[PDB]
Amino acid sequence: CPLMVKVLDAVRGSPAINVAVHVFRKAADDTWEPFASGKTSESGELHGLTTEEEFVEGIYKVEIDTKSYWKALGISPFHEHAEVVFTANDSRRYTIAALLSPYSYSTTAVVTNP
Amino acid sequence: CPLMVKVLDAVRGSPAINVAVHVFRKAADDTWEPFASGKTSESGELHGLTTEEEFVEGIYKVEIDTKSYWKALGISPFHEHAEVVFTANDSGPRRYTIAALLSPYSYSTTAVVTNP
Amino acid sequence: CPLMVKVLDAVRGSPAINVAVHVFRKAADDTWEPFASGKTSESGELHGLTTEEEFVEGIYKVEIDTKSYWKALGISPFHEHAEVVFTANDSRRYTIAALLSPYSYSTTAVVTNP
Amino acid sequence: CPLMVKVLDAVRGSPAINVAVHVFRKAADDTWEPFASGKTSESGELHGLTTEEEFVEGIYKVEIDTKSYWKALGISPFHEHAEVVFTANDSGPRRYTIAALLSPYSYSTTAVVTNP
Ligand SMILES: Cc1cc(OCC(=O)O)cc(C)c1Cc1ccc(O)c(Cc2ccccc2)c1
Ligand SMILES: Cc1cc(OCC(=O)O)cc(C)c1Cc1ccc(O)c(Cc2ccccc2)c1
């Protein structure tokens, strides 16, 4: 699929499982419209968010509900969520990886050619 | 000061200089209200965004304009910005440092929260 | 396999391909002895480093030749290499992930139960 | 001072305090010679490790004792330490800040290199 999300937990050294993830596309009036969502699997992965036909060029936001995830582990977190905003440009499979800690997160993009 | 932002460049091993930073606060009607903004200095620091009086409890969004930064350097980066969103001062006033590390296709953000 | 290495490139947004990786186990006299090595694949992965029988408890070092990798891209790097040192403890597949930038690197461990 | 180390804790959103740091320099015979060592302060900073005179060209290793840090907090971390290895002063004297961010199963390290 053209867009995949992979989330890891830096405290336990494991995939971040059952993390809610919502994806939005920016519309003509500059608001975010829901596009896709899911929960990460047992391997911290979220596949089948979209298809090639639907994933057109545009500005996308991937919002990862980190706060609910830490709350379920009984750990006080800093961030309300993690939000990754990017332009999808035709020329390409996107993997958005995120590494979570209660007071920090990192995100990287892996952009590859089939 | 109660809120400070520090930005580094992981390609150039230097502070990220002249990076625009915009801070918003969630209003009663659930919309983002403009709160303060500024530019990182030669040391990659942004001080003086706010005051103890003005920086009340709330949900804040710190948006770091990573894209314009990379573009001025001739790089086409992945992200539009780096965005940090947090509830501030929920148990009384704290001092927040938002530290960000930038690469063209990655960023990290961390918070240092201390009680004066 | 019990030990896997995955390396990403934060400058290009891609797997880090053809990165030399050497693994060492700490011996009784506190020196590092070569244990395994390889180069990352087209997907930035290095599999088949060791087997369950051979990967006993001990202190391991994973040395990732980041400097040669940046040099091949024509980019000046800071670090001589990236070196991840850990205790492998029985109770477990280890993924060591690393995210590379010329002046920074991060590494995380994903430790999972088959 | 020419070499400074700054350490943060990503679990506690605070400086990493009382972290041991050992610095070595590669000798002529290719072995690591002890160069300087110290403990991070209440701000997670380690200053005064060396001087401009003493900090000559060479390959240096900065070893941050992350394991003892986590253990004193009751965590069993993954890594034995965080180790940064770099050629220093190859085009003349520079000032180096080694910044590290710590989680039990992860760490990041970055370098800020400036020309006084
Ligand atoms: C907050 C701060 C105080 C500080 O005081 C030292 C000084 O400059 O005198 C120095 C620095 C480089 C910093 C910023 C800083 C420290 C560690 C660090 O890892 C980072 C960048 C970072 C940001 C997110 C994830 C990993 C790294 C910045
Ligand atoms: C481990 C892995 C598995 C994976 O699925 C395939 C597999 O499990 O073999 C896909 C990816 C991109 C990865 C690597 C990865 C996942 C999350 C993540 O945040 C990072 C980057 C990172 C690495 C170290 C420190 C901070 C951030 C890499």
Q: Which of A4, A99, A107, A110 most suits a substitution to test ligand 2, by most atoms within 8 Å of the C-beta?
A: A99
The experimental resolution of this structure, in angstroms, equals 2.0
Q: Comparing C-alpha atoms, which of B19, B24, B22, B1 is closest to residue B9?
A: B19
* Distance between CA atoms of residues B21 and B34, nearest Å: 11
Evaluate whether D27 touches D33 at the Cβ level (below 8 Å).
yes
Chain breaks in chain A (C to N over 2.5 A) after: 91
Evaluate whether D20 touches D68 at the Cβ level (below 8 Å).
yes
Evaluate whether A111 touches B76 at the Cβ level (below 8 Å).
no
Of the CA atoms within 13 Å of residue A24, those in its CB half-sphere come to 14
Query: What order do you get walking across the sheet with A32-39 strand by strand?
Result: A32-39, A20-26, A58-64, A82-88, B82-88, B58-64, B20-26, B32-39
Per the listing, tokens 């940064």 go with D84
Alpha carbon of B59: minimum distance to chain A alpha carbons (Å): 8
Q: Comparing C-alpha atoms, which of A97, A88, A87 is closest to residue A64?
A: A97
B106 CB within 8 Å of a chain D CB: no
> For residue D6, how far is its CA from the centre of ligand 1 (angstroms)?
7
- Given an 8 Å threshold on Cβ–Cβ distance, is C103 in contact with B78? no
Tell whether residue B26 is among the known ligand binding residues: no
Q: Comparing C-alpha atoms, which of B13, B8, C26 is closest to residue D81?
A: C26
DSSP-assigned letters across all residues of B42-103? TTSEE--S--TTT--SEEEEEEE-HHHHHHHTT---SBS-EEEEEEESBTB--EEEEEEEEE
* Distance between CA atoms of residues D104 and C64, nearest Å: 21
> For residue A78, how far is its CA from the centre of ligand 2 (angstroms)?
22
Token pair belonging to D45: 């900073």
Q: Is the CB of A106 under 6 A from ligand 2?
A: yes
Number of Cβ within a 10 Å radius of residue B72: 10
For A50, which DSSP code? Answer: -
What residue spans of chain C are helical by DSSP H? 66-72
For β-strands C14-15 and C3-9, DSSP reports them as antiparallel
Evaluate whether D46 touches D20 at the Cβ level (below 8 Å).
no
Helix (H, G, I), strand (E, B) or coil at C72: helix
Q: Whose CA is nearest to atom 21 of ligand 2?
A: C99
For residue C83, the cross-strand partners are C63, D83
- Chain-centre distance for alpha carbon D60: 10
User: At C61, which amino acid appears?
Assistant: K
φ/ψ of A68, rounded to 5, equals: -60, -35
Per the listing, tokens 């020196």 go with C31
- Given an 8 Å threshold on Cβ–Cβ distance, is B107 in contact with A107? yes
Evaluate whether A98 touches A8 at the Cβ level (below 8 Å).
yes
* Distance between CA atoms of residues D36 and D75, nearest Å: 28
For residue B16, the chain C residues in CB contact (below 8 A) are none
* Distance between CA atoms of residues B109 and A109, nearest Å: 15
* Distance between CA atoms of residues A50 and B33, nearest Å: 32
C87 CB within 8 Å of a chain D CB: yes
- Nearest chain C residue to A16 by CA distance is C110
- Nearest chain D residue to B107 by CA distance is D108
Q: Environment class of residue D2 by beta-carbon count within 10 Å: exposed (0-12), middle (13-18) or buried (19+)?
A: middle
Q: Which domain holds residue D27?
A: 1-116
A101 CB within 8 Å of a chain D CB: yes
Q: Environment class of residue A74 by beta-carbon count within 10 Å: exposed (0-12), middle (13-18) or buried (19+)?
A: exposed
Q: Is the CB of D10 under 6 A from ligand 1?
A: no
Q: Which of D3, D5, D6 most suits a substitution to test ligand 1, by most atoms within 8 Å of the C-beta?
A: D6
User: At C5, which amino acid appears?
Assistant: V
Q: Comparing C-alpha atoms, which of A23, A12, A19 is closest to residue A98?
A: A19
Experimental method: X-ray
Q: Is the CB of A104 under 6 A from ligand 1?
A: yes
For C27, which DSSP code? Answer: -
* Distance between CA atoms of residues A66 and A95, nearest Å: 18
> For residue C6, how far is its CA from the centre of ligand 2 (angstroms)?
7
Cα–Cα distances (Å) from A18 to A1, A42, A98, in that order, read 20, 7, 14
Q: Environment class of residue A95 by beta-carbon count within 10 Å: exposed (0-12), middle (13-18) or buried (19+)?
A: middle
* Distance between CA atoms of residues D112 and D5, nearest Å: 10
Alpha carbon of B27: minimum distance to chain C alpha carbons (Å): 36
Helix (H, G, I), strand (E, B) or coil at A73: coil
What value does the CA radius of gyration of chain A take, rounded to a whole number of Å?
Answer: 14
CATH number at residue C35: 2.60.40.180
Number of Cβ within a 10 Å radius of residue C73: 13
Longest dimension (CA), chain B: 44
Cα–Cα distances (Å) from B77 to C14, C102, D106, in that order, read 13, 16, 25
* Distance between CA atoms of residues A108 and B101, nearest Å: 12
Q: Testing the interface with D: which of A67, A79, A100, A101 to mutate, by most D Cβ within 10 A?
A: A101
For residue A10, the chain C residues in CB contact (below 8 A) are 108
For β-strands A3-9 and A93-101, DSSP reports them as parallel
Give residues with Cβ within 8 angstroms of D30, minimum separation 6.
none
Closest listed ligand to the CA of C104: 1
B11 CB within 8 Å of a chain A CB: no
Evaluate whether A108 touches C11 at the Cβ level (below 8 Å).
no
How many separate domains does chain C show? 1
Alpha carbon of D27: minimum distance to chain C alpha carbons (Å): 15
